[PDB]
Design a protein around this ligand. Structure first.
Ligand SMILES: [Cl-]
Ligand SMILES: [Cl-]
Ligand code: NI
Ligand code: NI
Lengths: 294, 304
């Protein structure tokens, strides 16, 4: 009775509680073939991949993981530098988990915060990856360097959620269900929840309802403003580029990704932010093609 | 029986609810001399002037007003452009209030949002003013032009409160007393509430406890992100400068200095401006009342 009996949106997939030095990672595991790890972002959990994972599982062993501190993964204790919720730390943790599953090398696709984990993992440990896909992001450095009025107003949450505790946490606590539902609605094409399966929205809402989970999300954004930014700035100063074959998908950027990656393909997808849920067929097909190439 | 029973922070001053075409303005009115309007900002009310008002009342008729929609002033119905909470509209409304009081010309000092009212009023209607003082600000345009990663983190509320309704309103409902007290403390030198009279803090808390009042504040920040910025941008493109004799005061550790040297910015905006720092954070009249009152008295007064 320690976990809610939420809807199963991955029929046929198993459940794994994977040990790491920073805590357990929860994942769904399905398919057969070369390993492909899929990482969600904010304010979601691993269930966001439920419409694309079955297709991918024809050709790949698909591992659909809750990021450190999100969903059902354990929540390591943070510190004043937000260390465990840095993308560098999260990447190291997820490497530990994949090694538990039998995989020293793997393919990787990430969305939003999970895409940030993914490009940081590719910078820090490129040898771990066969191929990388990032969905609807630019590097964290790039978002901050372009900060001006227009962006401050659009991505206000990068600066609000990064304010020192307990400010955002005390505000999110009033009506968390409103905040989470309006965030998911507002960055879809339609501007409503019609794109999401209601069972998926329930997973998101149940996660967001827990104050400890919301504190993790704020620590993630505090890393995003500080350590993650400094980590990216070090790579910019040395002109470091990802050598892993990469695919950048975005909701209707490749020019930004060339500065950061020496072998990058891209495509627009007819979607708002939430590509795997808004445009599952088009997203699945792009990823299937990319990851099947050798 | 609905009012709280609170001590008078302006002994000797009258209390007036002044009619305008947009709604009443509440003000305390004291002293003797030519008129001087004082305009507070966020998340405050007219009581923020309570430590400098007595000194200024020695030589001036001091009119200490709650901004449109703040404190005890009426809340004009907003619209999609947040018109009544634009600094242009607030300026027009406070001009109506001063005219009802019998003052077609006056001297003006403003802090924070009230300083934004005040420079907009000087741009739009310079003939109304004898002298202008702005405290701890640069023009809205200048903050936005400097809105990089560091400033986006420091003055996050400029972007947060400007999100479309009901996002910030619903969040602020989460713990409004914490929010206002944290805002007030964060912009002080000590980083706590020790600079403020606890009785003034209670005024600010009571105001902020009201959801209709918090909605006004958000509309003010929406105006600050949109129409107020555009109105500034028009003047900057034209090279329009404030012609009124002006004073810019700022905190040595306040908001305006954070990403600028303020006197040189104001010289881009004003042809007859003087300025100086005050040893303070953002809340000059409460953190540094003696220094601030002296500066103000010297600037507005013809006597040394
Ligand atoms: Cl490596
Ligand atoms: Cl005029
Ligand atoms: Ni259990
Ligand atoms: Ni009553």
């Amino acid at each position: 009775g320690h976990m809610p009996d939420l809807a199963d949106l991955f029929p046929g997939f198993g459940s794994e509680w994977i040990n790491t030095s920073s805590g357990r990672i929860f994942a769904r595991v399905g398919g057969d073939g070369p390993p492909l790890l899929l990482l969600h972002g904010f304010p979601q959990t691993h269930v966001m991949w439920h419409r694309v994972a079955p297709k991918l599982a024809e050709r790949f062993k698909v591992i659909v993981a809750d990021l450190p501190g999100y969903g059902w993964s354990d929540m390591p204790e943070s510190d004043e530098q937000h260390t465990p919720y840095t993308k560098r730390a999260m990447a190291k943790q997820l490497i530990e988990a994949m090694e538990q599953l039998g995989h020293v090398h793997f393919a990787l696709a990430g969305h939003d915060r999970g895409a940030r984990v993914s490009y940081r993992l590719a910078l820090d440990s490129p040898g771990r990856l066969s191929k990388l896909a990032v969905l609807d992001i630019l590097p964290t450095y790039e978002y901050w360097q372009r900060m001006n009025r227009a962006y401050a107003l659009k991505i206000y949450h990068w600066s609000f959620l990064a304010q020192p505790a307990p400010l955002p946490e005390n505000l999110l606590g009033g009506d968390p269900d409103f905040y989470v539902k309006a965030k998911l609605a507002s960055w879809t094409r339609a501007g409503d929840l019609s794109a999401f399966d209601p069972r998926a929205v329930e997973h998101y809402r149940i996660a967001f309802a827990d104050p400890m989970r919301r504190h993790v999300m704020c620590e993630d954004y505090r890393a995003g403003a500080y350590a993650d930014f400094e980590h990216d700035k070090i790579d910019v100063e040395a002109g470091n580029k990802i050598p892993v074959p990469m695919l950048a998908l975005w909701g209707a950027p490749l020019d930004v990704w060339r500065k950061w990656a020496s072998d990058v393909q891209g495509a627009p997808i007819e979607s708002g932010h939430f590509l795997p849920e808004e445009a599952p067929d088009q997203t699945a097909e792009a990823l299937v093609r990319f990851f099947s190439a050798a």
